Amino acid sequence: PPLTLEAIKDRVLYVLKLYDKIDPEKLSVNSHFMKDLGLDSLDQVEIIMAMEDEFGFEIPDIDAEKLMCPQEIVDYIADKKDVYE
Amino acid sequence: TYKFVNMREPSMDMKSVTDRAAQTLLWTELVRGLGMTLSYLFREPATINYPFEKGPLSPRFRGEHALRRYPSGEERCIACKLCEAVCPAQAITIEAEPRADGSRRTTRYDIDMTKCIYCGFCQEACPVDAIVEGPNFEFSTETHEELLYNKEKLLNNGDKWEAEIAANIQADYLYR
């Protein structure tokens, strides 16, 4: 059963909820981690940590540094997993 | 010059080959070892039974320290701090004071027998032969605190082993 963009939609957002500091009110599609969500680059690291083991891939620091907005992850793992529908 | 140690090529004569073949087949160097130990079995053991008889030493042996005193009875230590200044382990800790008689003795002479390493420099240090290790290699204690000697224990050791220190120093005062 191939997955869709909406299949990622929840699943990227879902794995983000597990982090304790992130506030349930401040999540959004375009929400800024550093400014809106209020993270640090260190805090930017482990929301990546939650994200590849959940989906099952590996993203290096070559690209892990600018995926900061939640949908910036979605449009990224879409091309990594070739989900284009 | 130098000497080669092991490259001795064995001869290939039939006598030599059979000798080696007999050696390998009928184990001989193994028997040579057995005969060796058996010969070294009927010797006289080098052991000595403990304290009933004790091992041999020399008059300049280094052991438990002691603070001797003059023939009059006055202590030799005039507290020149030379032994503290030469102590490699910094075990010597002394403070002096002008005594009631006016003489120059030390209030405290704690020697920490758990620090110093029995260099013997202290017996070489003081020009009055005040501190000196006794021949008593045996002063093992059950608690750590007992090893930390003060001035009082040092004088007691001086009063106990005085017969040995006078005799041993008498023997070796000419070699130094």
């Binding site: 640090d40 680059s41 260190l42 690291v45 940590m49 620091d61 892990a64 | -």
Partner: protein, 115 residues
């Protein structure tokens, strides 16, 4: 003069980069040591200790310096995943037996003459 020989990094950015895969490796490393080393702390109780060192080491700005401790961190990580350290060595990070030290001036004044 100002021109100095850099160790590996060529400015702050990749110096900021190297501290990341150290954190990348350290974060992945915490849960298995808690299991392998039979530690008493929780898996959660290890990430903070890994974390808190990092911005404890935050005033540093020189690129050469940054690359110098990322090697020390890598070596510390190196000597950890081969169980070369022991339970005591790892636990030394958790200042456990050492009683809490006061911070306010008045408590400093009560205990003893020290700043």
């Amino acid at each position: 003069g100002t021109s100095v020989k850099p160790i590996f990094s060529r400015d702050m950015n990749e110096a900021k980069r190297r501290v990341r895969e150290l954190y990348r490796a350290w974060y992945r490393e915490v849960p298995n040591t808690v299991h392998l080393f039979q530690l008493d702390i929780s898996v959660k109780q290890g990430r903070d200790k890994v974390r808190e060192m990092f911005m404890k080491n935050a005033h540093v700005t020189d690129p050469r310096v940054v690359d110098l401790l990322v090697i020390k961190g890598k070596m510390e990580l190196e000597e950890t995943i081969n169980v070369w350290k022991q339970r005591t060595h790892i636990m030394r990070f958790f200042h456990e037996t050492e009683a809490p030290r006061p911070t306010d001036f008045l408590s400093k004044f009560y205990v003893g003459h020290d700043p």
